[model samples]
Target: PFVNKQFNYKDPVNGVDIAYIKIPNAGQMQPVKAFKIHNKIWVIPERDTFTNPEEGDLNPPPEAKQVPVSYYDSTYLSTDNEKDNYLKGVTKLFERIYSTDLGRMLLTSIVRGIPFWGGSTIDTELKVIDTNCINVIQPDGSYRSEELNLVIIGPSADIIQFECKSFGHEVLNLTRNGYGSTQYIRFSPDFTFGFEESLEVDTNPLLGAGKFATDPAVTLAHQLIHAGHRLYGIAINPNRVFKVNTNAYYEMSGLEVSFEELRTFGGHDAKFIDSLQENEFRLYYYNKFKDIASTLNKAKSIVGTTASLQYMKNVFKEKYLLSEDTSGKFSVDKLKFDKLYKMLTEIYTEDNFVKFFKVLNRKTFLNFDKAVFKINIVPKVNYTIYDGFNLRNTNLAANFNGQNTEINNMNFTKLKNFTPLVPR
Candidate 1:
């Protein structure tokens, strides 16, 4: 194992270049420079030349190698005159994030058999849209691109319902050598029913792909808006839709790109959001009604506040389609609320929701079945036009009527041990 038990000689050239130092040897000296060939190794018999041959590459390296986004960004976007090259790089990088390999798979796994929709918007309020823009802030302050929006929906006997909304923002690193998305995405799985509740898919890769996952038209809005913002530090309003791709030319990189296909969600399949937007409005007002119920008639139960005369009226409104705002002044029509409920149920599609509606539509606001009034009491309030207060701070009422909430209410409790809500 030990080749030399008494290895003694250390070359003086260990700390220095022995090539530069002349050594007496049977072999003649050769220029180390002369034999500096790529990937070639030398053995003894190789000698250094007395005189140094002209060192270094006689001809400089060709124009083939490069660095950074700038290096890749020199190409013209055949469709425009501005920096088209950077756009393509960003595009390709996003493509890697949203589609290939695991992206679509994970996204599909996330939303399998689940209801979903996509839409587009642009904030063109940037001054002189030519090169000025505005930036949307991500809750996280990181240097990377990300998803724009996400929604989770459920319900309908007209099953009961629940929904959640989260949005994403765009990021581009053009000036520096770094160009990649740093996304904080958490797509959920369908825990619809039964023992399968324990199952879940790994979706880490599909998130934070870029601003481009939804549709071609969606994130490009972010880009053009930013291009303009970057141009003159423009300030854009919150809601604006921009129209890109009027004229076809080179994108400074000389790359010819066509955005006509970008018009539709995924090309050929044109969709509209009129129905969705209407539903959104309906839900907003409907939620406000529920908020009123909680604020005006909440009664103390043995544990928490649960009894409510107002809640009864509100549920009746949702059931019979009552036209009422958070304020008593702006009464809404019952049929409109009914229509919204129907719309939601239609979207819901599952039979369990209709059953949810069955028990949900039990009684009207004006009528209460005392047999069902076995819970304890709390009450007081009549500030009609006042904007009203959030009983639970900044938290929303979305989960107040869902599964776990009901379970919480139905839990067995003592009749007199705690402060109780007086039943009607």
Candidate 2:
């Protein structure tokens, strides 16, 4: 039967009965290692190895290769060698310095800049607050903490909530529901820390899968990527969260992203975003709102496309695409860009943005021809690739302490140079 089961357990070395437990695994829930951090269960997933290789890779250092793995198959400790070895090794993860052989794994984990934090030690958890009792932010930029009513809205057809926690080596199977690329927040004791639900987008039938159709691993990865970024922020509720999905987020480092019609775009799940964007417009700040109004008659590219489109894209990615910072802005090579980026808000906001970006056509009003025309959103033969989006600042420095660069450097290669989301 399915249950959170624990058997009468004892430590193998000391022969003292420890409260060890047996855990089942979900396909999406595979971790190479698991251990206890005092009272709370803590695990070191296969991803956060705390290793170090070259400048931009996940390989652990050569000297650190001989670290012992558990003799137990992730089930229960069985030998004194395994127990003491792990006892010393696991604590190395909590050790703050990367100067030691074991510390490289910790260094490597931080290098990629993915997960929110390492194992939740009582010392570390002391720094993190329980939002349940803290103040939440209002859209109007005010904070309030008090009694309130909460509502739970389930989609008519949605992916089920996850059944694992960050603490345990969790295995959860989350199939696509009728909700498809869409999902919500879920709460469970399984997750000492909880997560949100599935997306509720108008999924493409080709790829828009029904309930249980989507892979649990891909789905959960998508949620966690977003959640990691969100949780890294101040635990206080947002005064006004982005509310609108700006179509900007990072790809998981170790995960192999995939794409398909559920079939056409196929691979592992790391390359492609879970559902795709603004339907795809959310992906295109340049295509939807910015324009070269007779002024970008003001521009043209080697690809013969309106240069203004590229102009618009650059600035939006720089300003709005990244951080929540609006007070400060950067200077671009040309174009009164910041002025144009703000203009799009007149047409869209969190409230009506759902109605935004129905099309990808880039229209230029005052181009070389002195008239409006559709600029091919797709690249043409003459395309001189605009390698600008690669420069977006992590912009999220305020969220996680010292994590800004890791988050920023994760995708600096430029989403346009052909990330799965951007097709040639």
Candidate 3:
């Protein structure tokens, strides 16, 4: 292994190049030149004329390629140690979901089926959309581009930017808080799910299995349905009765979607919401009733009992269909609240949503003749009307009767222990 070893014979040339050096070779003086070649000092016999090395002679090994950032980001995550544990918790939660019988059934109810089989369209759409923008933050803050960034380089990019962005942590936060959503990649039967970086500890199995509102895995599954339902709908029948001919123009990438289709895809009928804007209250609430209704229906099958759905209603009653006001006005109307509660608990559907809104998709909002808004689209939602509505903070009424805040008897400890499991 040790072919050559030398000591006390260090080269005087070191790394510097010299025009010539003399050495005794075979008892005669010889001319030699020290040249730095390939980052090494070499002594070669001199010729009549010497030419210095140039460009290709001193090429250094290529710099290490830059890589994308893939660790938990404290900037977006809570510095709290327990909350940060989601990193370990989510992985454990998923392992059970993927391996256990009940967990797989729960997943089945949420996604309807395996999501990986039909995701090429989403992949292509993501590829196309990514070309329109560049990440403002270089991966590893290096000069080379290897991974995507959350921030945008410019305004023209078609990136679906969001607040509190992370690898999978925000998705977990989304599911945990009930606002989980899929990225807006279109023209494919495939879909993808998002999660949080608190994967290790954020996805606590106890909370995931019991807590309905903050059930991290369940919420993601629910949103995945929203994504898959629309994607599979269009991919299977590109030119459905609505006549968008979605598959016609460049893989439907440029096709202008119909208003009804947009509503279905959005998981809310904007036409219905716009029609109700004429009223004094404006009924400007977000249309998450569909999500609640749909996810609950699936939960009935997953848990094999009506109690899961019933318990969901018991926990999130009036807060289910809440609204916000940008005008800084908070109006309280008992009669309005009563009717909305009834409508949401019963007969909530795409067709029935118009009944409360008081009109169908209007021509103005639909912009049938010309497109009103056009770009990649995805469904999103807010789970709570009030801040800190989750089980960790607030106590809810044991039985949701009506307008009785003082008689509250339930707390997080009880709910956390209440499993939605029951025999069919």
Better of 1 and 3 by TM-score: 3
Model 1 scores a C-alpha lDDT of 0.21
| Per-model root-mean-square deviation over C-alphas | 34.4, 25.4, 29.5
What order do you get sorting by TM-score, best first? Answer: 3, 2, 1
Best by TM-score: 3
Q: Model 3, 303-399: lDDT tens per residue?
A: 2223353443333223333332563223334565446432322222323322322222222212211111111111111112111112223333222
The reply for model 2, stretches above 4 Å from the true place, is: 1-75, 78-81, 88-128, 131-268, 271-275, 278-424
Decoy 2 TM-score against native: 0.19
**Looking at candidate 2, what is the lDDT of residue 375?**
14
Work out the TM-score per prediction: 0.15, 0.19, 0.20
lDDT of each: 0.21, 0.22, 0.24
lDDT of 2 by residue, 1-424 (tens): 0012232112331111122212221122221223333212232222221111111222333343211110111222234443343333223312312223222332231122221111123321211112111133333445433211110111111112221122211221111100001112221110011111233445533221111111111222223222222221111122212212222223312212122111111122112333453123222333321221222222223221234545543433332232212533222222333333222212112111111211111111100010111111112121111211112233432332111223433321211110122101
